[PDB]
C-alpha cells in the first residue's frame, strides 16, 4: 500500500431504482442474522420486471481504482426465470485494455455451506482516465463501494498463527 481506501462508486440508493436491490442471503450472516457483502449489491427486477442495463464510470479522483463484480450461476432455473426472466445470459464488462463477456447456464453443484448455487467473482484495476462499462441481462453482482488507492511497493503478505 502507498494509499488504500474505500469509497462509494455507485450508491445503493439512486443507482438502481429500476431493479430491486435489497436481496441478501443467509449463509452470509451477522451474529446469526442474514446479510451480504458490504461493498456490493444484488439486482433483480421490479416485481418480476427486469429491464436490461448499461452503466459506466471513469475516474475523476486521479488515483488508481480497484473494482469488483460477479456473474450469477443459479443451481436451478426457476430462480433464473423468476428473477431475471431470461434463459439467455449475456453480460459485457468492458474497458480499454481489458474486456470480457459472460453467458453462463444453470450448473448444479453439491452442497457447500448448504449452497449449490454459485456466483463467480471477477475484478480489475482501473487507472485514472480509463472508463469501465457494464452491460447485462442480469445475473450480476454490482459494485456499491469500490477501492480507491495508490500502489505501494515492497510490502507483502504473511501466513502466521503467532
Amino acid at each position: 500500500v502507498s494509499s488504500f481506501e474505500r469509497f462509494e462508486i455507485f450508491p445503493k440508493e439512486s443507482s438502481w431504482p429500476n431493479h430491486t436491490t435489497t436481496g441478501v442471503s443467509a449463509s452470509c450472516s451477522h451474529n446469526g442474522e442474514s446479510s451480504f457483502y458490504k461493498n456490493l449489491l444484488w439486482l433483480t427486477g421490479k416485481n418480476g420486471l427486469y429491464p436490461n442495463l448499461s452503466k459506466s464510470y471513469a475516474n475523476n479522483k486521479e488515483k488508481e481504482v480497484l473494482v469488483l463484480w460477479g456473474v450469477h450461476h443459479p443451481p436451478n432455473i426457476g430462480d433464473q426465470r423468476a428473477l431475471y426472466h431470461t434463459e439467455n445470459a449475456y453480460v459485457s464488462v468492458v474497458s480499454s485494455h481489458y474486456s470480457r463477456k459472460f453467458t453462463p447456464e444453470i450448473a448444479k453443484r453439491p452442497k457447500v455451506r448448504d449452497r449449490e448455487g454459485r456466483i463467480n467473482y471477477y475484478w480489475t484495476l482501473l487507472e485514472p482516465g480509463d472508463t469501465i462499462i457494464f452491460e447485462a441481462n442480469g445475473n450480476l453482482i454490482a459494485p456499491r463501494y469500490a477501492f480507491a488507492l495508490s500502489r505501494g511497493f515492497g510490502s507483502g503478505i504473511i501466513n502466521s498463527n503467532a
Epitope: 435489497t22 436481496g23 441478501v24 443467509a26 442474514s34 418480476g48 423468476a82 449452497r115
Partner: single-chain antibody, 236 residues
Framework: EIVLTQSPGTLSLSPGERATLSCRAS???????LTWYQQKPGQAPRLLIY???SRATGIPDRFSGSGSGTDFTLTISRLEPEDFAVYYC??????????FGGGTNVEIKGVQLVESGGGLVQPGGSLRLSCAAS????????MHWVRQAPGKGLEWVSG???????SYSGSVRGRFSISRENAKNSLYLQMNNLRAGDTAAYFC?????????????????????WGQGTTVTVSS
C-alpha cells in the same frame, strides 16, 4: 404503502357461475406485486393466485385473473358451495409494507409453524407472543406477523427481512417489538401499551426467500406458508 379497494366485499351468487372480483389501488403498481388468498371462517388462509395471472400448488383450474397497473383482477370460472369464503388481496410494497384488501365474501345461494401465547391481558398492558418453527430453515425467509379482526378486513401488523430492515405501520410502531432467532428456529413479539384495536386473531407468516440457498425451493413475491394463528384480547 398504497390504499387498496376490493370490489365487492361481499357477493351472493348461484352455482355454476363465474365471479369477477377487482382489487384496485391508488397508483399503478407493476403486476407481479399481488397475491390472492381465501379463508373459511374457522380455517387459516390458503394461497390461490399470484401476480394477477399465475397459479399456486394443489389446485383446480377455475380461479383465474388478469389486470395490471392500477387495477388488478381475479375472476372465477365456476362457483361451488365448497368455496364459501372470504378472499383477500395482499400486495408487497416497494416501501416494504404489505397492504391488504378488506376481504370479499362469496356467498353461494341455494414444515409447519406453531404460535404461542394468545389470550387475554388488561388494556394498556404488556404481553409477549412467540412462534416456533418445524422442519425447515428459518434462516432464509422474510417473516411477517399479521392480524385479523373477526369477519373483517385484515391489517398487517409487522414484518422483517433477515437483513434486519423492519417494517411496521406508523400507528402500530413502538407499541410492538419483534425479535428473530434462527439457531433456535423461533420468533418473538414482545408487545406493550395494548388497546381494543388489538382485540383480534393474529398469525405468524413465513414469506419470501431472500436471495440465495440450496433447495428445490422456488420463491414468489407471495407468501410461502401461514400459521394457525391465535386470539389476542384486552379486557377488564
Amino acid at each position: 404503502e398504497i390504499v387498496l379497494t376490493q370490489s365487492p366485499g361481499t357477493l351472493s351468487l348461484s352455482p355454476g357461475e363465474r365471479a369477477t372480483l377487482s382489487c384496485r389501488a391508488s397508483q399503478s403498481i407493476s403486476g407481479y406485486y399481488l397475491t390472492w388468498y381465501q379463508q373459511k371462517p374457522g380455517q387459516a388462509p390458503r394461497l390461490l393466485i399470484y401476480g394477477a395471472s399465475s397459479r399456486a400448488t394443489g389446485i383446480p383450474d377455475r380461479f383465474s385473473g388478469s389486470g395490471s397497473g392500477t387495477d388488478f383482477t381475479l375472476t372465477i370460472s365456476r362457483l361451488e358451495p365448497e368455496d364459501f369464503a372470504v378472499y383477500y388481496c395482499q400486495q408487497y410494497g416497494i416501501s416494504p409494507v404489505i397492504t391488504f384488501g378488506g376481504g370479499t365474501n362469496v356467498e353461494i345461494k341455494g414444515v409447519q409453524l406453531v404460535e404461542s401465547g394468545g389470550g387475554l391481558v388488561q388494556p394498556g398492558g404488556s404481553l409477549r407472543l412467540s412462534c416456533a418453527a418445524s422442519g425447515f430453515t428459518f434462516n432464509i425467509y422474510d417473516m411477517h406477523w399479521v392480524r385479523q379482526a373477526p369477519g373483517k378486513g385484515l391489517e398487517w401488523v409487522s414484518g422483517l427481512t433477515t437483513g434486519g430492515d423492519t417494517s411496521y405501520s406508523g400507528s402500530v410502531r413502538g407499541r410492538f417489538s419483534i425479535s428473530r432467532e434462527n439457531a433456535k428456529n423461533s420468533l418473538y413479539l414482545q408487545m406493550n401499551n395494548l388497546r381494543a384495536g388489538d382485540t383480534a386473531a393474529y398469525f405468524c407468516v413465513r414469506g419470501v426467500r431472500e436471495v440465495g440457498a440450496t433447495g428445490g425451493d422456488p420463491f414468489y413475491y407471495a407468501m410461502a406458508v401461514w400459521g394457525q394463528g391465535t386470539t389476542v384480547t384486552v379486557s377488564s
